[PDB]
Design a protein around this ligand. Structure first.
Ligand SMILES: [Mg+2]
Ligand SMILES: [Mg+2]
Lengths: 198, 199
């Protein structure tokens, strides 16, 4: 049972890394078979299909993202500092993405938006976790006098997500961290100047 | 004739581009390109040596289309800030009318090519560098005219604008709502008008 659970874990883990780089359609099952020692058969002992593996792999990738944000946001007391910590998680993707190939939420978004309802919904669910996190921080901050009462929480969330993800895209194309540094500095300054209260 | 061949190539490249924009390069099979062009495989590869060369030509086509769209969007403004905000407005207009079916081909090709294909990556980078040069030229013009604060870092602004607007294109498509593009536009237009514009 342990062998099974660990072999499933290495299959999903390696699948997620390869999918994150070449996409679902462009990652050949044979290469995942190759990357897991299953070149002579047996990947279907753990998954019914490549599509089921894709969903499991995305869930794995989403868990890594979730862990990166949970660690990044822990320990801050002031709600604005916590929101800035959220920016810093994305900032750190320039050289340290959640897994090889960059942000799997951004990567899967581009592939699935016009091709795959189930992956679309899984991407949207993660985006919605992020919106909920920011909404809750803004609400608590407003209540504590740390954030201005007029701040539109979801508008702020959508701006942060768009800016940081677009910068993640740019940083891997331009092969430099500078877009992420600039996007971070812009939003941190904006937040401190226009969102923060005390 | 050679004229007919040049036209046939144009048609194939245009159809390939639309398919690749949706399903990607690896996910678009030659049989899909056949169906969309009404051509047999041999009819396509008479004009292209390979799927790879076709993919490159299809991107160059997508790049030119994006270029035309910015060209019309940016033409004729009387103030450099108006011109920079019109660059945002081009992206905002993607909400209902992307440059081609399936969204921004620069964004879409970036995500696929960045860790897979040096030649497409270089082409994507060249497009991003054109946008950066456009915005830098406008910023230096505006500074010369007293329209833009001299302290404005042009390339910092360019990369912020591109990151924001492209991230919003991604979000608007995945959330199935224009709202992220509208918010991004408003945020940047307001920021530029309040902090970049001098007079
Ligand atoms: Mg797409
Ligand atoms: Mg990629």
């Amino acid at each position: 049972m342990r062998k099974g659970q660990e072999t499933r874990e290495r299959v999903v883990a390696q699948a997620a890394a390869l999918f994150n780089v070449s996409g679902y359609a462009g990652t050949a099952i044979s290469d995942i078979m190759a990357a897991t020692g299953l070149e002579k058969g047996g990947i279907y002992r753990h998954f019914e299909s490549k599509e089921q593996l894709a969903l499991a792999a995305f869930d794995y990738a989403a868990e890594k993202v979730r862990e990166r944000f949970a660690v990044g946001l822990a320990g801050h007391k002031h709600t604005v500092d916590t929101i800035i910590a959220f920016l810093d998680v994305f900032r750190s993707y320039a050289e340290r993405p959640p897994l090889v190939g960059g942000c799997p939420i951004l990567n899967t978004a581009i592939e699935s938006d016009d091709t795959n309802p189930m992956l679309r919904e899984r991407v949207r669910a993660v985006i919605d976790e992020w919106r909920e996190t920011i909404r809750t921080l803004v609400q608590t901050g407003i209540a504590r006098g740390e954030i201005r009462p007029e701040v539109d929480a979801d508008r702020l969330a959508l701006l942060i997500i768009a800016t940081m993800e677009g910068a993640v895209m740019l940083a891997r194309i331009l092969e430099t961290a500078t877009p992420l540094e600039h996007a971070y500095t812009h939003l941190a300054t904006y937040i401190t100047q226009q969102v923060r209260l005390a």
